[PDB]
Scaffold this active site. Structure first.
Site, PDB file in Angstrom:
ATOM      1  N   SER C 118       0.808  -1.234  -0.012  1.00 41.36           N
ATOM      2  CA  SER C 118      -0.300  -0.418   0.636  1.00 41.36           C
ATOM      3  C   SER C 118       0.809   1.332  -0.476  1.00 41.36           C
ATOM      4  O   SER C 118       0.673   2.373  -0.537  1.00 41.36           O
ATOM      5  CB  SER C 118      -1.337   0.010   1.202  1.00 41.36           C
ATOM      6  OG  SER C 118      -1.852  -0.959   1.242  1.00 41.36           O
ATOM      7  N   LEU C 120       3.631   1.820  -1.336  1.00 45.53           N
ATOM      8  CA  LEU C 120       3.441   1.804  -3.259  1.00 45.53           C
ATOM      9  C   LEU C 120       2.145   1.891  -4.306  1.00 45.53           C
ATOM     10  O   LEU C 120       2.030   3.088  -5.149  1.00 45.53           O
ATOM     11  CB  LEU C 120       4.651   0.670  -3.748  1.00 45.53           C
ATOM     12  CG  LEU C 120       5.884   0.464  -3.215  1.00 45.53           C
ATOM     13  CD1 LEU C 120       6.090  -0.620  -3.682  1.00 45.53           C
ATOM     14  CD2 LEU C 120       6.183   1.973  -4.472  1.00 45.53           C
ATOM     15  N   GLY C 121       1.447   2.040  -3.159  1.00 47.23           N
ATOM     16  CA  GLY C 121      -0.137   1.889  -3.667  1.00 47.23           C
ATOM     17  C   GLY C 121      -0.500   3.916  -3.983  1.00 47.23           C
ATOM     18  O   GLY C 121      -0.837   4.248  -4.827  1.00 47.23           O
ATOM     19  N   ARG C 122      -0.132   3.904  -2.589  1.00 46.57           N
ATOM     20  CA  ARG C 122      -0.474   5.550  -2.458  1.00 46.57           C
ATOM     21  C   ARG C 122       0.702   6.450  -3.414  1.00 46.57           C
ATOM     22  O   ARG C 122       0.491   7.285  -3.420  1.00 46.57           O
ATOM     23  CB  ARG C 122      -0.393   5.813  -0.945  1.00 46.57           C
ATOM     24  CG  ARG C 122      -1.343   5.584   0.095  1.00 46.57           C
ATOM     25  CD  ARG C 122      -0.839   5.120   0.985  1.00 46.57           C
ATOM     26  NE  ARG C 122      -1.963   4.433   2.523  1.00 46.57           N
ATOM     27  CZ  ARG C 122      -1.265   4.180   3.009  1.00 46.57           C
ATOM     28  NH1 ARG C 122      -0.666   3.350   3.435  1.00 46.57           N
ATOM     29  NH2 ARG C 122      -2.587   3.080   3.833  1.00 46.57           N
ATOM     30  N   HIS C 128       1.169  -5.895 -10.208  1.00 44.55           N
ATOM     31  CA  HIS C 128       0.274  -6.126 -10.459  1.00 44.55           C
ATOM     32  C   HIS C 128      -0.703  -5.262 -10.575  1.00 44.55           C
ATOM     33  O   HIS C 128      -1.579  -4.845 -10.251  1.00 44.55           O
ATOM     34  CB  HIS C 128      -0.551  -7.529  -9.128  1.00 44.55           C
ATOM     35  CG  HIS C 128       0.067  -8.764  -9.656  1.00 44.55           C
ATOM     36  ND1 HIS C 128       1.263  -9.183  -9.632  1.00 44.55           N
ATOM     37  CD2 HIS C 128      -0.271 -10.021  -9.694  1.00 44.55           C
ATOM     38  CE1 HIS C 128       1.012 -10.084 -10.102  1.00 44.55           C
ATOM     39  NE2 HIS C 128      -0.367 -10.931  -9.783  1.00 44.55           N
ATOM     40  N   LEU C 144       6.053  -9.799 -11.144  1.00 41.08           N
ATOM     41  CA  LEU C 144       5.502  -8.650 -11.200  1.00 41.08           C
ATOM     42  C   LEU C 144       5.015  -7.875 -12.204  1.00 41.08           C
ATOM     43  O   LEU C 144       6.256  -7.686 -12.875  1.00 41.08           O
ATOM     44  CB  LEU C 144       6.227  -8.632  -9.913  1.00 41.08           C
ATOM     45  CG  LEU C 144       6.438  -8.653  -8.742  1.00 41.08           C
ATOM     46  CD1 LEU C 144       7.650  -8.191  -7.962  1.00 41.08           C
ATOM     47  CD2 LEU C 144       5.490  -9.106  -7.947  1.00 41.08           C
ATOM     48  N   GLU C 145       3.837  -6.968 -12.791  1.00 35.96           N
ATOM     49  CA  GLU C 145       3.036  -6.701 -13.481  1.00 35.96           C
ATOM     50  C   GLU C 145       3.231  -5.077 -13.518  1.00 35.96           C
ATOM     51  O   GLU C 145       2.464  -4.647 -12.546  1.00 35.96           O
ATOM     52  CB  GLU C 145       2.178  -6.833 -14.179  1.00 35.96           C
ATOM     53  CG  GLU C 145       2.189  -8.644 -14.131  1.00 35.96           C
ATOM     54  CD  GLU C 145       0.807  -9.444 -14.025  1.00 35.96           C
ATOM     55  OE1 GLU C 145      -0.117  -8.384 -13.509  1.00 35.96           O
ATOM     56  OE2 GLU C 145       0.429 -10.453 -13.830  1.00 35.96           O
TER      57      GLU C 145
END
Lengths: 175, 175, 175
Positions: C118, C120-122, C128, C144-145
């Protein structure tokens, strides 16, 4: 196992799962709808280096925000055009962070997953860049990772933005 | 708990979970593969305002579609180039909506999650912008939210596009 | 049901779930943190046609990589600028494939879901493009995508990149 509506109601009633504020009309068959807050964060450094403290500005909207895909060529004239045509308070491109209105606390025997609303996914607006599982024991509001992938999307303060799905743990976690 | 292959087979056999059409070869260890329909929706308004009815056109392909990332500069010459080189029927950029071929009905004790195929995720093609949990009691085909994030991707009618993962609810939902 | 910390520890101890390498400090309340490998794949064909064998180059970084959003206008001068300013070994735009350091094997009674971190999502970095459920019986590292959706993001070799969430199956799968 995923909590049904009646399980969500039981867990909220006994304070096993804290949801503040709580609206019983937001309980679905096996999820709880959450809503969009009026405060947003926008980053203003050149690159994201998580080894450093990140610089951000905080924006508060009165009613609505237009979220444009990255690389939309937002001139100041285009921004005025969108504000007058669609009555939005703020126009942004690329990623912006928001928050749910709802503050939650999860017990040691539940993990919850945040999912953005499918009506919004169908217009290529996401509010999470990850699968969104939240640790057992978590306390907090949910941070939303908002990006539009097709055309600009109007978001409204307090609108339903996503849902929480609750799952039982096999055993209680240590905190 | 996630349904295994043998559970999926039991639930389909007794009509607890409806899958139409159903192909037993699509049952994986703990998922069911679904396939891509030939009908797509493309939006043609300037912005997405979900308080209004959305204007769309419907496209039907014979065999295949090239999905290009947003802001690909698709001139009519570039479109012809792709059609002749890759034998695709239609070339689109940015988001397009598709559908599974499969129509499902979920009982009151199962929720299912749609996930796009990992072979496609590895080429940065997504068919869902959200985590994809589907309510207990749902009836319908699955609406696919298709975007390419790196280079154009050829999709074929009837190809395996994603999978459904089925989970037990802790208790039955009310509808 | 999702495995708690103590369940993850039990399953790793008895070799029911293989995680190599394993660090007990990576066990969270109901997940296991995985780390970023130093090897990446970048595609170099014009379009992705999964009916054909895909051409790729393999890149190995010493320490770090700057992942830029698609259509960043990476001139050779801009690349040098980023390398000198942020001390990265490699600068890429759009999608790149990476891998976890960790090799896993799942038994017939567990499915695992990969979720990007999260933090990194932030910053709008995903690892992915799908919901990330992994078949019971799976053996392998996790592919990992990786795509950045807002501004360039520095990734470091061996950093925590994501987490595995483990779920019980209702019944054992056939392989």
């Amino acid at each position: 196992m995923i909590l049904s509506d009646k399980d969500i109601i039981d867990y909220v009633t006994s304070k096993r799962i804290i949801i503040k504020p709580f609206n019983k009309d937001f309980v679905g068959p096996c999820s709880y709808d959450v809503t969009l807050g009026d405060e947003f964060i926008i980053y203003d450094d050149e690159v994201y280096d998580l080894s450093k403290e990140l610089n951000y500005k905080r924006i508060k909207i009165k009613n609505s925000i237009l979220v444009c895909p990255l690389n939309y060529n937002l001139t100041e004239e285009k921004i005025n055009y969108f504000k007058e045509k669609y009555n939005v308070d703020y126009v942004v491109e690329g990623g912006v962070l928001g928050t749910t209105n709802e503050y939650i606390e999860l017990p040691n025997d539940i993990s919850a997953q945040y999912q953005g609303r499918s009506s919004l996914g169908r217009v290529f607006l996401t509010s999470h860049q990850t699968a969104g599982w939240i640790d057992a024991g978590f306390k907090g509001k949910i941070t939303l990772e908002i990006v539009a992938f097709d055309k600009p999307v109007i978001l409204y303060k307090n609108q339903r933005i996503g849902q929480l799905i609750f799952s039982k743990l096999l055993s209680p976690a240590d905190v």
